[PDB]
Write a protein that binds this ligand. Structure first.
Ligand SMILES: [Ca+2]
Lengths: 35, 223
């Protein structure tokens, strides 16, 4: 598993949730440019 | 959009870009003064950009109009992404022409196996990142509820559907959120979320617009 079910994280500005399959799923927005 | 094609300028005349100093989400023009997008695309101060092809060059099809109201569904839940829909009222009506045109709302929900058109300016790679200058398009079918639920156990509500390809390779992706899924000439979906992009057994998940036709009409009428 790449994640523990129920955890959360951000990838850049998108929010992600860890499903019961142990896989992240994230929203699909664009984000501010990096420094 | 991963595995897509160049739409061609203004061939998707209802596609808008939401801009917060930079492009961050898509949306769909549903009448001259209202846009449908994803609730997770909410920000105050959005500028809506209509008539775009090359999102980084001023080409002459464009109208930039500030949002006057950006209305997240009251039952949007950021924890589950249920009810991931937002209405944006434009501060003034867009001028409608061949390049800037509305898309109709559905009269019934879409069926598994119908081909749809998904579009946006999001990432075109499943590994790493490449953002296109021009609007990209993808033909993708509605997937069965059972295959959607199997791919995303415990996460698919009645307000979501999956579209794409279980074999992977073709999907929406980061930067496409809020944009359209059009099937049978109607706005059936809103780009919402997924596990990665274009991965096997992880199709895109989309807000099911047909569940919100009354809500949309009522929200427009009262605002
Ligand atoms: Ca442009």
């Amino acid at each position: 598993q790449e994640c523990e079910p129920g955890q959360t994280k951000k990838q850049d500005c998108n929010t992600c949730r860890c499903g019961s399959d142990g896989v992240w799923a994230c929203t699909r927005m664009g984000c501010p440019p990096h420094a | 959009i991963v595995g897509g094609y160049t739409c061609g300028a203004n061939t998707v005349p209802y596609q808008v870009s939401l801009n917060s100093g930079y492009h961050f989400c898509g949306g769909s023009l549903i009448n001259s003064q209202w846009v449908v997008s994803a609730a997770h695309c909410y920000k105050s101060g959005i500028q809506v950009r209509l008539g775009e092809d090359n999102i980084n060059v001023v080409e002459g099809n464009e109208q930039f109009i500030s949002a006057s109201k950006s209305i997240v569904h009251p039952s949007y839940n950021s924890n589950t992404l249920n009810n991931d829909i937002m209405l944006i009222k434009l501060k003034s009506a867009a001028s409608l022409n061949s390049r800037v045109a509305s898309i109709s709302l559905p009269t019934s929900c879409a069926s598994a196996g119908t081909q749809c058109l998904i579009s946006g300016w999001g990432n075109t790679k499943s590994s790493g990142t490449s953002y296109p200058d021009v609007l990209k398009c993808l033909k993708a079918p509605i997937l069965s509820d059972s295959s959607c639920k199997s791919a995303y156990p415990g996460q698919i509500t009645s307000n979501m559907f999956c579209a794409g390809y279980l074999e992977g390779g073709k999907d929406s992706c980061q930067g496409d959120s809020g944009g359209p899924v059009v099937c049978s000439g109607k706005l059936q979906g809103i780009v919402s979320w997924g596990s990665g992009c274009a991965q096997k057994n992880k199709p895109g998940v989309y807000t099911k617009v047909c569940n919100y036709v009354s809500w949309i009409k009522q929200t427009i009428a009262s605002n």
